[PDB]
CSV table of C-alpha atoms in Angstrom, one decimal:
chain,number,residue,atom,x,y,z
A,1,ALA,CA,-21.9,-4.7,10.3
A,2,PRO,CA,-20.5,-7.2,12.5
A,3,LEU,CA,-18.6,-8.2,8.9
A,4,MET,CA,-17.9,-5.3,6.5
A,5,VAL,CA,-15.3,-5.1,3.2
A,6,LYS,CA,-14.5,-2.0,1.2
A,7,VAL,CA,-13.2,-1.7,-2.0
A,8,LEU,CA,-11.7,1.3,-3.7
A,9,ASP,CA,-9.9,1.2,-7.3
A,10,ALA,CA,-6.3,3.0,-7.3
A,11,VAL,CA,-6.0,3.6,-11.7
A,12,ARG,CA,-10.0,5.4,-10.8
A,13,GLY,CA,-9.5,7.3,-7.9
A,14,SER,CA,-13.1,6.0,-7.7
A,15,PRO,CA,-14.7,3.2,-5.2
A,16,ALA,CA,-13.9,-0.6,-6.7
A,17,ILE,CA,-18.4,-0.9,-7.7
A,18,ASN,CA,-19.6,-4.7,-8.7
A,19,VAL,CA,-16.8,-6.4,-6.8
A,20,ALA,CA,-17.7,-9.9,-6.1
A,21,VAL,CA,-16.9,-10.8,-2.9
A,22,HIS,CA,-17.2,-14.4,-1.0
A,23,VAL,CA,-16.7,-15.1,3.0
A,24,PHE,CA,-16.2,-18.8,4.0
A,25,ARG,CA,-15.6,-20.4,7.6
A,26,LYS,CA,-13.2,-23.1,7.8
A,27,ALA,CA,-15.1,-26.3,9.5
A,28,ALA,CA,-13.9,-28.8,11.6
A,29,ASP,CA,-12.5,-30.6,9.5
A,30,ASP,CA,-10.3,-28.3,7.9
A,31,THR,CA,-12.0,-27.2,4.9
A,32,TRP,CA,-13.2,-23.8,3.3
A,33,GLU,CA,-17.5,-23.8,3.9
A,34,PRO,CA,-19.1,-20.6,2.3
A,35,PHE,CA,-20.4,-18.5,4.4
A,36,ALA,CA,-21.5,-15.4,2.6
A,37,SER,CA,-21.1,-13.5,-0.9
A,38,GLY,CA,-21.9,-10.5,-2.8
A,39,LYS,CA,-21.0,-7.5,-4.5
A,40,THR,CA,-19.8,-4.4,-3.4
A,41,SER,CA,-22.3,-1.1,-4.1
A,42,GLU,CA,-22.0,2.1,-5.9
A,43,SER,CA,-20.1,3.6,-2.5
A,44,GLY,CA,-17.5,0.6,-3.1
A,45,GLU,CA,-18.8,-0.7,0.0
A,46,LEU,CA,-20.3,-4.8,0.6
A,47,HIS,CA,-23.1,-4.6,4.1
A,48,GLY,CA,-25.3,-7.3,5.5
A,49,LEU,CA,-23.1,-10.6,5.3
A,50,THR,CA,-23.4,-12.0,8.3
A,51,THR,CA,-25.0,-11.3,11.5
A,52,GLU,CA,-23.5,-11.1,15.0
A,53,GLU,CA,-25.2,-14.6,15.9
A,54,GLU,CA,-24.2,-16.4,12.6
A,55,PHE,CA,-20.6,-14.5,12.7
A,56,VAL,CA,-19.4,-17.6,15.4
A,57,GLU,CA,-15.3,-17.7,16.6
A,58,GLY,CA,-13.3,-19.3,13.8
A,59,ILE,CA,-10.9,-18.7,11.0
A,60,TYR,CA,-12.3,-17.0,8.2
A,61,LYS,CA,-11.7,-16.1,4.6
A,62,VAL,CA,-12.9,-13.3,2.5
A,63,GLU,CA,-12.3,-13.8,-1.3
A,64,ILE,CA,-11.9,-10.7,-3.5
A,65,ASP,CA,-12.2,-11.1,-7.2
A,66,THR,CA,-10.4,-8.6,-8.6
A,67,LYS,CA,-9.7,-10.6,-12.1
A,68,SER,CA,-13.7,-11.3,-12.3
A,69,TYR,CA,-13.6,-7.0,-11.8
A,70,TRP,CA,-11.0,-6.7,-14.4
A,71,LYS,CA,-12.2,-8.8,-17.0
A,72,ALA,CA,-15.2,-7.2,-16.7
A,73,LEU,CA,-13.1,-3.3,-16.8
A,74,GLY,CA,-11.8,-5.1,-20.8
A,75,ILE,CA,-8.5,-4.8,-18.4
A,76,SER,CA,-5.5,-8.2,-18.5
A,77,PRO,CA,-4.6,-8.1,-14.4
A,78,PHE,CA,-2.3,-10.3,-12.9
A,79,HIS,CA,-3.7,-12.2,-9.4
A,80,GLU,CA,-6.7,-14.5,-9.6
A,81,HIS,CA,-8.2,-12.5,-6.5
A,82,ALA,CA,-7.0,-10.8,-3.0
A,83,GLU,CA,-7.1,-13.4,-0.3
A,84,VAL,CA,-7.8,-11.8,3.6
A,85,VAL,CA,-7.2,-15.3,5.8
A,86,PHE,CA,-7.2,-13.9,10.0
A,87,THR,CA,-8.9,-15.6,13.2
A,88,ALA,CA,-12.5,-14.0,14.1
A,89,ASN,CA,-14.2,-13.2,17.3
A,90,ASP,CA,-11.7,-15.3,19.9
A,91,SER,CA,-12.1,-12.8,22.4
A,92,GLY,CA,-15.2,-12.7,22.1
A,93,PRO,CA,-17.6,-9.9,19.4
A,94,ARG,CA,-16.0,-7.5,17.3
A,95,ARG,CA,-17.0,-5.8,13.9
A,96,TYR,CA,-14.8,-6.2,11.6
A,97,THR,CA,-14.2,-3.6,8.1
A,98,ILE,CA,-11.6,-5.7,5.6
A,99,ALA,CA,-10.4,-2.5,2.9
A,100,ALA,CA,-8.3,-3.2,0.2
A,101,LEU,CA,-7.4,-0.6,-3.0
A,102,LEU,CA,-6.6,-2.2,-6.2
A,103,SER,CA,-4.9,-1.9,-8.9
A,104,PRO,CA,-4.0,-4.0,-12.0
A,105,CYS,CA,-0.5,-5.8,-10.9
A,106,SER,CA,-1.3,-5.0,-7.2
A,107,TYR,CA,-3.2,-4.6,-4.3
A,108,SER,CA,-3.1,-4.0,-0.1
A,109,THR,CA,-5.9,-4.9,2.5
A,110,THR,CA,-5.9,-3.8,5.9
A,111,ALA,CA,-7.8,-4.7,8.9
A,112,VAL,CA,-9.9,-1.8,11.0
A,113,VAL,CA,-11.2,-4.0,14.0
A,114,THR,CA,-13.6,-2.5,16.6
A,115,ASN,CA,-15.8,-3.6,19.9
A,116,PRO,CA,-19.7,-2.7,20.0
B,1,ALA,CA,25.7,5.3,-1.1
B,2,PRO,CA,23.8,6.0,2.0
B,3,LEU,CA,20.9,6.9,-0.1
B,4,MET,CA,19.1,4.2,-3.2
B,5,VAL,CA,15.7,5.3,-4.5
B,6,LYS,CA,13.7,3.1,-6.3
B,7,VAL,CA,10.3,3.3,-8.1
B,8,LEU,CA,7.9,0.6,-9.0
B,9,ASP,CA,4.6,0.7,-10.8
B,10,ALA,CA,1.4,-1.3,-9.7
B,11,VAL,CA,-0.8,-0.9,-13.4
B,12,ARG,CA,2.2,-2.4,-15.4
B,13,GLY,CA,3.9,-4.1,-13.0
B,14,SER,CA,7.3,-3.8,-13.4
B,15,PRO,CA,10.0,-1.1,-12.4
B,16,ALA,CA,9.3,3.4,-13.0
B,17,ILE,CA,12.4,3.3,-15.5
B,18,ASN,CA,13.0,7.2,-16.6
B,19,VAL,CA,11.4,9.5,-13.6
B,20,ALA,CA,13.4,12.1,-12.4
B,21,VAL,CA,13.2,12.4,-9.0
B,22,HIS,CA,15.0,15.1,-6.5
B,23,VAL,CA,16.5,15.0,-3.8
B,24,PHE,CA,17.5,18.5,-1.7
B,25,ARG,CA,18.2,18.5,2.3
B,26,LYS,CA,16.7,21.1,4.8
B,27,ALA,CA,18.5,24.3,5.0
B,28,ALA,CA,19.6,26.4,8.1
B,29,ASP,CA,16.6,28.9,7.2
B,30,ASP,CA,14.0,26.4,6.5
B,31,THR,CA,14.4,26.3,2.6
B,32,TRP,CA,15.4,23.0,0.0
B,33,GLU,CA,18.9,23.4,-0.9
B,34,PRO,CA,18.9,21.0,-3.9
B,35,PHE,CA,21.2,18.0,-2.6
B,36,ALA,CA,21.5,15.8,-5.8
B,37,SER,CA,18.8,14.0,-8.8
B,38,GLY,CA,19.2,12.0,-11.5
B,39,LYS,CA,16.4,9.9,-13.6
B,40,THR,CA,15.3,5.9,-12.5
B,41,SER,CA,17.2,3.5,-14.3
B,42,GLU,CA,15.5,-0.3,-16.4
B,43,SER,CA,15.5,-1.7,-13.3
B,44,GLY,CA,13.9,1.6,-11.6
B,45,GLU,CA,16.2,2.2,-9.1
B,46,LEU,CA,18.4,5.6,-8.9
B,47,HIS,CA,21.9,5.0,-7.8
B,48,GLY,CA,25.2,7.2,-7.0
B,49,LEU,CA,22.8,9.9,-5.7
B,50,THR,CA,25.7,10.9,-2.9
B,51,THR,CA,28.3,9.6,-0.5
B,52,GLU,CA,28.9,8.6,2.7
B,53,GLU,CA,30.2,11.9,3.2
B,54,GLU,CA,28.4,13.8,2.0
B,55,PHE,CA,24.9,12.4,3.5
B,56,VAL,CA,25.3,14.1,7.2
B,57,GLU,CA,22.1,14.2,9.5
B,58,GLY,CA,19.5,16.4,8.8
B,59,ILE,CA,16.3,16.1,7.1
B,60,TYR,CA,15.5,15.5,3.3
B,61,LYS,CA,13.0,15.6,0.8
B,62,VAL,CA,12.6,13.5,-2.0
B,63,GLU,CA,10.7,14.2,-4.7
B,64,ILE,CA,9.5,12.1,-7.6
B,65,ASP,CA,7.9,13.1,-11.0
B,66,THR,CA,5.1,11.1,-11.2
B,67,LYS,CA,3.1,13.7,-12.8
B,68,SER,CA,5.4,13.3,-16.5
B,69,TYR,CA,5.8,9.4,-16.0
B,70,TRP,CA,1.9,9.3,-15.7
B,71,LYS,CA,1.4,11.8,-19.1
B,72,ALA,CA,4.1,9.7,-20.8
B,73,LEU,CA,2.1,6.7,-20.7
B,74,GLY,CA,-1.0,8.3,-21.8
B,75,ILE,CA,-3.0,8.5,-19.2
B,76,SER,CA,-3.9,11.3,-16.4
B,77,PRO,CA,-2.4,11.1,-12.8
B,78,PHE,CA,-4.5,12.5,-9.9
B,79,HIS,CA,-1.0,13.7,-7.7
B,80,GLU,CA,1.5,16.7,-8.9
B,81,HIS,CA,4.8,14.2,-8.1
B,82,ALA,CA,5.3,12.3,-4.7
B,83,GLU,CA,7.2,13.7,-1.6
B,84,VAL,CA,9.2,11.7,1.0
B,85,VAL,CA,10.2,13.6,4.0
B,86,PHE,CA,12.5,12.3,6.6
B,87,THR,CA,14.7,12.6,8.6
B,88,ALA,CA,18.6,10.4,8.9
B,89,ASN,CA,19.8,9.3,11.5
B,90,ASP,CA,23.1,8.3,12.9
B,91,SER,CA,22.7,5.6,15.6
B,92,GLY,CA,24.9,2.7,13.7
B,93,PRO,CA,26.2,2.0,10.4
B,94,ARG,CA,23.8,2.7,8.1
B,95,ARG,CA,22.4,2.0,4.2
B,96,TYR,CA,18.6,4.2,3.1
B,97,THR,CA,16.8,2.8,0.6
B,98,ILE,CA,13.6,5.0,-0.4
B,99,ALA,CA,10.8,2.7,-2.4
B,100,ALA,CA,8.1,3.8,-3.9
B,101,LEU,CA,4.9,2.3,-5.4
B,102,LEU,CA,2.8,4.4,-8.1
B,103,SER,CA,-0.5,3.8,-9.3
B,104,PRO,CA,-2.9,6.8,-11.0
B,105,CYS,CA,-4.5,7.5,-7.9
B,106,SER,CA,-2.2,6.2,-5.4
B,107,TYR,CA,1.1,5.9,-4.4
B,108,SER,CA,2.6,4.4,-1.0
B,109,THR,CA,6.3,4.6,0.2
B,110,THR,CA,8.4,2.3,2.4
B,111,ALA,CA,12.0,3.5,3.9
B,112,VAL,CA,14.0,-0.3,3.9
B,113,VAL,CA,17.1,0.5,5.9
B,114,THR,CA,19.7,-2.1,6.7
B,115,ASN,CA,23.5,-2.1,7.9
C,1,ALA,CA,15.7,-18.0,-11.6
C,2,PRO,CA,11.7,-17.0,-13.0
C,3,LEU,CA,10.1,-17.1,-9.3
C,4,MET,CA,11.2,-14.7,-6.9
C,5,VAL,CA,9.6,-13.2,-3.2
C,6,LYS,CA,11.0,-10.2,-1.7
C,7,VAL,CA,9.6,-9.4,1.8
C,8,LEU,CA,9.9,-6.0,4.2
C,9,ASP,CA,8.1,-5.0,7.2
C,10,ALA,CA,6.8,-1.8,7.2
C,11,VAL,CA,7.1,-1.6,11.3
C,12,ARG,CA,11.1,-1.9,11.6
C,13,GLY,CA,11.7,-0.6,7.7
C,14,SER,CA,13.5,-3.5,6.6
C,15,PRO,CA,13.6,-6.9,4.8
C,16,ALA,CA,11.4,-9.1,6.5
C,17,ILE,CA,14.2,-11.9,7.8
C,18,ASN,CA,13.5,-15.8,8.3
C,19,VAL,CA,10.1,-15.6,7.3
C,20,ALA,CA,8.3,-19.3,5.8
C,21,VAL,CA,7.2,-18.8,2.7
C,22,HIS,CA,5.4,-21.8,0.2
C,23,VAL,CA,4.7,-22.1,-3.4
C,24,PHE,CA,2.0,-24.2,-4.6
C,25,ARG,CA,1.1,-25.0,-8.0
C,26,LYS,CA,-3.0,-25.7,-8.3
C,27,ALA,CA,-3.1,-29.2,-10.0
C,28,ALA,CA,-6.4,-30.2,-12.9
C,29,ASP,CA,-8.1,-31.6,-10.0
C,30,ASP,CA,-8.2,-28.1,-8.5
C,31,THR,CA,-6.2,-28.6,-5.5
C,32,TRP,CA,-2.6,-27.1,-4.5
C,33,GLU,CA,0.9,-29.1,-5.6
C,34,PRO,CA,3.2,-27.9,-3.2
C,35,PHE,CA,6.0,-26.6,-5.7
C,36,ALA,CA,8.4,-24.8,-3.2
C,37,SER,CA,9.7,-23.4,-0.2
C,38,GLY,CA,12.2,-21.8,1.5
C,39,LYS,CA,13.5,-19.1,4.1
C,40,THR,CA,13.6,-15.3,3.7
C,41,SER,CA,17.0,-14.2,4.1
C,42,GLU,CA,18.7,-11.4,5.4
C,43,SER,CA,17.8,-9.0,2.2
C,44,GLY,CA,14.4,-10.8,2.4
C,45,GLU,CA,14.6,-12.4,-0.3
C,46,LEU,CA,14.0,-16.4,-1.7
C,47,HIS,CA,16.4,-17.4,-4.8
C,48,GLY,CA,16.3,-20.8,-6.1
C,49,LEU,CA,12.4,-21.8,-5.7
C,50,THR,CA,12.6,-22.9,-9.5
C,51,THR,CA,13.8,-23.1,-12.3
C,52,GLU,CA,12.6,-22.5,-16.5
C,53,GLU,CA,12.4,-26.2,-17.0
C,54,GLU,CA,10.4,-26.7,-13.9
C,55,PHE,CA,8.1,-23.2,-14.0
C,56,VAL,CA,5.4,-24.1,-16.8
C,57,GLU,CA,2.1,-22.0,-17.3
C,58,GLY,CA,-0.6,-21.9,-14.8
C,59,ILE,CA,-2.5,-20.8,-11.9
C,60,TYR,CA,0.4,-20.8,-8.1
C,61,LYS,CA,0.1,-19.5,-5.2
C,62,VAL,CA,2.6,-18.3,-2.8
C,63,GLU,CA,2.1,-18.1,0.8
C,64,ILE,CA,3.7,-16.9,3.7
C,65,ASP,CA,4.1,-16.9,6.8
C,66,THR,CA,3.7,-13.6,8.6
C,67,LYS,CA,1.9,-15.2,11.4
C,68,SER,CA,4.9,-16.8,13.2
C,69,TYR,CA,7.4,-13.0,12.0
C,70,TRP,CA,4.9,-11.4,13.7
C,71,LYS,CA,4.7,-13.2,16.9
C,72,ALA,CA,8.7,-13.7,17.1
C,73,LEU,CA,9.0,-9.9,17.3
C,74,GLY,CA,6.5,-10.4,20.3
C,75,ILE,CA,3.4,-8.9,18.2
C,76,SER,CA,0.1,-10.4,18.2
C,77,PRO,CA,-0.9,-9.9,13.8
C,78,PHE,CA,-4.3,-10.3,12.4
C,79,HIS,CA,-3.7,-12.3,9.2
C,80,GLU,CA,-3.0,-15.9,9.3
C,81,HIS,CA,-0.7,-15.9,6.4
C,82,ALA,CA,-0.6,-13.3,3.3
C,83,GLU,CA,-2.3,-16.0,0.6
C,84,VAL,CA,-0.5,-14.0,-3.3
C,85,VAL,CA,-2.8,-16.5,-6.2
C,86,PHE,CA,-1.7,-15.5,-9.7
C,87,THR,CA,-1.3,-17.3,-13.5
C,88,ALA,CA,2.3,-17.5,-15.0
C,89,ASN,CA,1.4,-16.5,-18.6
C,90,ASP,CA,4.4,-17.2,-20.7
C,91,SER,CA,3.8,-14.3,-23.3
C,92,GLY,CA,7.4,-12.9,-24.1
C,93,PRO,CA,11.0,-13.9,-21.5
C,94,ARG,CA,9.1,-13.4,-18.8
C,95,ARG,CA,10.8,-13.3,-14.3
C,96,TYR,CA,8.3,-12.5,-12.0
C,97,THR,CA,8.9,-11.0,-8.6
C,98,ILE,CA,6.5,-11.0,-5.9
C,99,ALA,CA,7.0,-8.6,-3.2
C,100,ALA,CA,5.2,-8.0,-0.2
C,101,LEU,CA,5.1,-5.5,2.2
C,102,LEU,CA,4.3,-6.5,6.1
C,103,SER,CA,2.2,-4.3,9.3
C,104,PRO,CA,0.4,-6.1,12.3
C,105,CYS,CA,-2.9,-5.6,10.5
C,106,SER,CA,-2.1,-5.0,7.1
C,107,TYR,CA,0.4,-6.4,3.9
C,108,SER,CA,0.0,-5.3,0.5
C,109,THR,CA,2.2,-7.3,-3.0
C,110,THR,CA,3.1,-6.3,-6.1
C,111,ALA,CA,3.9,-7.9,-8.8
C,112,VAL,CA,7.0,-7.1,-10.9
C,113,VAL,CA,7.4,-8.8,-14.1
C,114,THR,CA,10.2,-7.8,-16.2
C,115,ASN,CA,11.8,-9.8,-19.4
D,1,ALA,CA,-16.7,17.2,2.3
D,2,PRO,CA,-15.3,18.9,-1.1
D,3,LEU,CA,-12.7,18.1,1.3
D,4,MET,CA,-12.2,15.2,3.5
D,5,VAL,CA,-9.1,13.7,4.8
D,6,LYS,CA,-9.7,9.6,6.7
D,7,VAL,CA,-6.3,7.5,7.9
D,8,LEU,CA,-6.0,4.1,9.8
D,9,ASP,CA,-3.2,2.5,11.5
D,10,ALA,CA,-2.1,-0.5,9.7
D,11,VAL,CA,-0.3,-1.6,13.3
D,12,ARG,CA,-3.4,-1.2,15.6
D,13,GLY,CA,-5.8,-2.9,13.2
D,14,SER,CA,-7.4,1.3,14.1
D,15,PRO,CA,-8.8,4.8,12.7
D,16,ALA,CA,-6.0,6.8,13.8
D,17,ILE,CA,-7.3,9.4,15.3
D,18,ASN,CA,-6.0,13.1,16.7
D,19,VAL,CA,-3.8,12.9,13.4
D,20,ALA,CA,-2.9,17.2,12.5
D,21,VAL,CA,-3.6,18.0,9.1
D,22,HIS,CA,-3.0,21.1,7.6
D,23,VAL,CA,-3.7,22.1,3.7
D,24,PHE,CA,-2.1,24.8,1.6
D,25,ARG,CA,-2.9,26.8,-1.6
D,26,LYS,CA,-0.2,27.4,-3.6
D,27,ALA,CA,-0.5,31.5,-4.1
D,28,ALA,CA,-0.5,33.5,-7.4
D,29,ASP,CA,3.3,34.2,-6.4
D,30,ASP,CA,4.5,30.4,-6.0
D,31,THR,CA,4.4,29.8,-2.1
D,32,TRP,CA,2.6,27.8,0.0
D,33,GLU,CA,-0.4,29.7,1.9
D,34,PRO,CA,-2.3,28.3,4.7
D,35,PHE,CA,-5.9,27.0,3.2
D,36,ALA,CA,-7.6,25.2,6.4
D,37,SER,CA,-6.3,22.8,8.9
D,38,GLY,CA,-7.8,19.7,11.5
D,39,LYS,CA,-7.7,16.9,13.4
D,40,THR,CA,-8.3,13.1,13.1
D,41,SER,CA,-11.7,12.1,15.0
D,42,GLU,CA,-12.7,9.4,16.7
D,43,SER,CA,-13.1,7.7,13.4
D,44,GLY,CA,-10.2,9.0,11.9
D,45,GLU,CA,-12.1,11.1,9.7
D,46,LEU,CA,-11.6,15.1,9.2
D,47,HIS,CA,-14.4,17.0,7.5
D,48,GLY,CA,-15.7,20.7,7.8
D,49,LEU,CA,-12.1,22.3,6.5
D,50,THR,CA,-13.7,24.0,4.1
D,51,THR,CA,-16.9,24.5,1.6
D,52,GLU,CA,-18.0,24.7,-1.7
D,53,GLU,CA,-17.8,28.6,-2.7
D,54,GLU,CA,-14.3,28.6,-0.5
D,55,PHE,CA,-12.3,25.8,-2.6
D,56,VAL,CA,-11.8,26.9,-5.9
D,57,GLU,CA,-9.3,26.3,-9.0
D,58,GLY,CA,-5.6,25.7,-7.8
D,59,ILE,CA,-2.9,23.4,-6.5
D,60,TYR,CA,-3.3,21.8,-2.9
D,61,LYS,CA,-1.3,20.5,-1.1
D,62,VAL,CA,-2.5,18.4,2.4
D,63,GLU,CA,-0.1,17.5,4.8
D,64,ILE,CA,-0.7,15.0,8.0
D,65,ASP,CA,1.6,15.0,10.7
D,66,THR,CA,2.3,11.8,10.8
D,67,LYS,CA,5.1,12.0,13.0
D,68,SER,CA,3.4,13.8,15.6
D,69,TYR,CA,1.4,11.4,15.6
D,70,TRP,CA,3.5,8.6,16.5
D,71,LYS,CA,5.4,10.8,18.7
D,72,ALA,CA,2.7,11.3,20.5
D,73,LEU,CA,1.9,7.3,20.9
D,74,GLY,CA,6.2,7.4,21.9
D,75,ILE,CA,6.7,6.0,18.9
D,76,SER,CA,10.4,6.8,16.7
D,77,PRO,CA,8.8,6.5,12.9
D,78,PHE,CA,10.5,7.8,10.0
D,79,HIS,CA,8.8,10.0,7.9
D,80,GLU,CA,8.3,14.0,8.5
D,81,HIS,CA,5.1,13.3,7.8
D,82,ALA,CA,2.8,12.2,4.3
D,83,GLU,CA,2.0,15.5,1.8
D,84,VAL,CA,0.0,14.6,-0.9
D,85,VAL,CA,-0.2,17.8,-3.6
D,86,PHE,CA,-2.6,17.5,-6.2
D,87,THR,CA,-4.2,20.3,-8.5
D,88,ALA,CA,-8.4,20.4,-7.4
D,89,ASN,CA,-11.5,21.4,-9.6
D,90,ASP,CA,-10.1,22.5,-12.6
D,91,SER,CA,-13.1,20.4,-14.3
D,92,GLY,CA,-15.4,22.5,-12.6
D,93,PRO,CA,-16.1,21.2,-8.5
D,94,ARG,CA,-15.3,17.8,-7.2
D,95,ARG,CA,-15.6,16.3,-3.8
D,96,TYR,CA,-12.2,15.2,-2.8
D,97,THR,CA,-11.6,12.1,-0.4
D,98,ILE,CA,-7.6,11.4,0.7
D,99,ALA,CA,-7.9,8.3,2.6
D,100,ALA,CA,-4.1,7.1,4.4
D,101,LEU,CA,-2.3,4.2,6.1
D,102,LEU,CA,0.4,4.7,8.8
D,103,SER,CA,2.6,2.6,9.9
D,104,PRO,CA,6.1,3.6,11.8
D,105,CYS,CA,8.2,3.1,8.2
D,106,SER,CA,5.9,3.5,5.6
D,107,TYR,CA,2.9,4.9,4.5
D,108,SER,CA,0.1,4.9,1.5
D,109,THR,CA,-2.2,7.1,0.6
D,110,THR,CA,-5.4,7.0,-2.6
D,111,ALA,CA,-7.3,9.3,-3.9
D,112,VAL,CA,-10.8,9.2,-4.1
D,113,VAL,CA,-12.7,11.9,-6.5
D,114,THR,CA,-16.8,12.0,-7.5
D,115,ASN,CA,-19.0,14.2,-9.1
D,116,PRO,CA,-21.8,16.2,-6.8
């Protein structure tokens, strides 16, 4: 897991399951290029997004589709999604976890970065 | 007032209104001495808790009755209450705001200390 | 003003002052149209961004320049910026406050919507 | 892990290591009785606090010693500790994770509850 995403639900006190996540990388021409995507498991985790070789230096955007999540639960939330943008691997390879906590009108995100 | 409390509701996206709050100060024997209390306003704020003269250095506890708040909304919450415990320290002019953000199974709190 | 932004610093326990904020509205072609911008005040607030007349229903993006903020404090942060994206919906009288709490490697945001 | 504690550091973007945690249970006479204690590992996790048999119904308090944590790092924080109080196992046994995110002037806590 060079790149992992973990999402919790603050209303249910449980993992946020079936959350769609799209990752983008900024291209040489300054637009967002699709990089990888997936959905969280029953444990609220999303592995297998990429590999060390493909996860090169760059500016990455991790979009967590919180609206589609609350909508699938029949709830009316506020945010379109939770967007996490960061430079990665500019000092060599690292392993990144993006952790997120969701409520209908609020979210928090945190990064855990470790050296392999 | 050197001490103020602000409470927000992360589910409804608004202030948390009519939430009971109890403040205590740690006594010499390590027990919690009632210090001040009230209910948050329409703005989720609790003003006039204390004065400069009464608010001396020491350890204080701010107890927020989150359980009753959630129950009144028809929701079963996790925590019995939310407790914020900190040291008040003279080291320049100061006003303490204890902010809290509530969800049924989570809460966050931050201290905003200004001159 | 139906839109206001409040920013706090979880490390120093105080408002985040002089932080650049840019607001954008989603255009028909799905691009982000500059809408309003400014720097937070001594209270960590950004008032007078827009008016009722200009603030119509739609999708808006609030971009907070957290990277420059941390760099000015001598700290290397994780995020390039903090982006808050939401739909403004008429469904009664409303005032939107977008609150954000910043740490070098984390941020949280809540919408406080009142009548 | 009937009871687990996980703690992250929002300044370093890493697990909060060597964090002391004390757990108490309210006794019949309404005072806080020591129940278990430990410190977080290099992964910021604390397992082995108790067993299903010993973790009976009751009101529990999980105290995370954030002051001793920031002090050990030579930092001046605000909170004495992060205190998490909850009723557990009143509908039969559950597995509880208390997750916490720490900054010098702020903390957030979340509960994840699952049925074994």
